[PDB]
């Protein structure tokens, strides 16, 4: 409530998980990679596209 | 004659890679080629290996 309406910063309150290494059961972790030596700009173009 | 690894450069594929210095082949093939090579002395003048 206090900080969602706050222009100066992004503030995320949260209760730490008991075992953080597990993340969330619904969660997925993906790695988009530059496999042809196409460069940072191309990889982030792809990131934003995806 | 032996060639020398100087340092690394960033090839256009983004991978760090090597930089070598050596004589071009025509000037390091035969014992008469070593006469072509000039050092320079404390005075700024070129002196041949011969």
From TrEMBL, chain B:
Top-level lineage group: Bacteria
Protein name: Efflux pump membrane transporter
Family under the similarity heading: Belongs to the resistance-nodulation-cell division (RND) (TC 2.A.6) family.
Cellular compartments annotated: Cell inner membrane
Organism placement in taxonomy: Bacteria, Pseudomonadati, Pseudomonadota, Betaproteobacteria, Burkholderiales
């Amino acid at each position: 409530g206090r900080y969602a309406g706050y222009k100066d910063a992004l503030v995320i309150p949260f209760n730490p998980p008991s075992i953080p290494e597990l993340g969330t059961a619904a969660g997925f972790d993906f790695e988009l990679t530059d496999n042809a030596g196409l460069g940072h700009d191309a990889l982030m173009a792809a990131r934003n596209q995806l | 004659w032996a060639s020398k690894y100087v340092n690394n450069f960033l090839d256009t594929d983004g991978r760090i890679k090597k930089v070598y210095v050596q004589s071009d082949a025509p000037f390091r093939m035969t014992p008469e080629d070593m006469n072509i090579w000039y050092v320079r002395n404390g005075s700024g003048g070129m002196v041949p290996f011969s």
